[PDB]
Amino acid sequence: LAPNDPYYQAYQWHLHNATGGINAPSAWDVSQGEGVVVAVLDTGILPQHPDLVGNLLEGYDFISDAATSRRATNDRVPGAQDYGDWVENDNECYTGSVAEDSSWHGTHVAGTVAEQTNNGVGMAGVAHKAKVLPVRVLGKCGGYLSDIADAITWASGGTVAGVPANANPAEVINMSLGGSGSCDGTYQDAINGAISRGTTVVVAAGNETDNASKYRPASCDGVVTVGATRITGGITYYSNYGSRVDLSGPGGGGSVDGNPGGYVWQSGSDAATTPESGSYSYMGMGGTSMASPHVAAVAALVQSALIAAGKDPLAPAAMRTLLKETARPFPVSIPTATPIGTGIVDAKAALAAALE
Ligand SMILES: [Ca+2]
């Protein structure tokens, strides 16, 4: 499928480039992810972005701190509106932190997952007939481990005190987020719960040019940890690495690869603070945060295709094994000491093997 989105051909090398892309055109001839729910645990969403409407569920906001959420109270609330994660001043988040504008990170990641495609508007997305369940866990200066753990439980169909039962349990969780520290009990138990309910958990390896074993949730057991490659098919300068990394997706190499080829392109906003300070746009961002949703959406294409053929969905372990075994070996040598998994996720090869 060669969709008609105006910016797809020029910008979206991560979808269609022969060395650095995920082989999406051919995969789309087989599945678009219809009938699957991918939970995006992230900064929230711009629910009325014109290139996302139609593919979103209401979701929920698990941030339990008014200063972080920019809401009126410390309560968790329905919906996942991103209020903006900007920070006005240096050193507000930690020593040497630098002031920055709102990211709309969650809207970009949700775009990779399920941006409306072949609709004559903006960009394409990978599992563009799936639905995104936006679960807001990150705001000003990031988020809280206990919030993120409860979001994992709820997203995957588990019960959380004080939140109404999730009517839309997710077959796939994407966590484009990370922090220092090896995986603890709280994270691990929530992840184990999600796995026990059949949910595949896909996480970003992290951007510290360091061993993924030292960060969470990258280092958790049972998850798919995703490194980042460039348009060239080689490791990015920032990607974490190590034996915990299962495979990679296109994260964008940054300035070395120029514009557009250094960045992943999706729905976003140019707003610097609140949503109202700017307007809907398409933004280029680089990171393992951009690689992870490519792999999460391929998981959604596979589950969709199985369901469509009256076959059983894969269990989480089988899903990880499949994504690894079908990854495209890297077209540039990866150094021995910085392994980033078996290859770049290959949407078509994953579908072909699942449907054999
Ligand atoms: Ca579009």
Author numbering: 1 to 356
The authors write:
Through the COVID-19 pandemic it gained more prominence by being a key pathogen in respiratory co-infections. This study will present a structural analysis of StmPr1, S. maltophilia’s main virulence factor, an excreted serine protease. StmPr1 is a member of the subtilases family defined by Siezen & Leunissen et al.. It shows the main structural and functional elements of the family, such as a reactive triad consisting of Asp42, His105, and Ser28922. The catalytic triad consisting of Asp42, His105, and Ser289 is located on top of β1 (Asp42), α4 (His105), and α10 (Ser289).
StmPr1’s 36 kDa structure, solved and analyzed by x-ray crystallography, shares structural similarities with other subtilases, first described by Wright et al. for subtilisin BPN’24. StmPr1 has the subtilase-typical α/β fold formed by seven, instead of eight, parallel β-sheets with five α-helices surrounding the sheets where four helices are antiparallel to the sheets. Besides the seven parallel β-sheets forming the core, StmPr1 shows only antiparallel β-sheet formations in β2/β3, β6/β8, and β11/β12, all located on the fringes of the structure and therefore supporting the structural stability in most loop-rich regions of the protein. The protein also has two disulfide bonds, Cys93 - Cys141 and Cys183 - Cys220. Cys93-Cys141 links the loop connecting β1 and α5 to a loop covering the catalytic triad, beginning directly behind β3 at Gly79 and going to Ser103 on top of α4. Thereby, it strengthens the connection of the loop to the core structure helping to form a kind of lid above the substrate binding cleft. This lid is a loop insertion, not present in subtilisin BPN’24 Proteinase K26 Thermitase27 or subtilisin Carlsberg28. The lid may facilitate and support two distinct functions, on the one hand, the lid may move to block the entry into the substrate binding cleft, thereby preventing unwanted binding to the catalytic triad. On the other hand, closing it also stabilizes potential substrates inside the substrate-binding cleft. The StmPr1 protease exhibits some special and additional structural features, like a relatively high content of Glu and Asp residues and a relatively low content of Arg and Lys residues on the surface, which may give the enzyme the ability to be active in an alkaline environment.
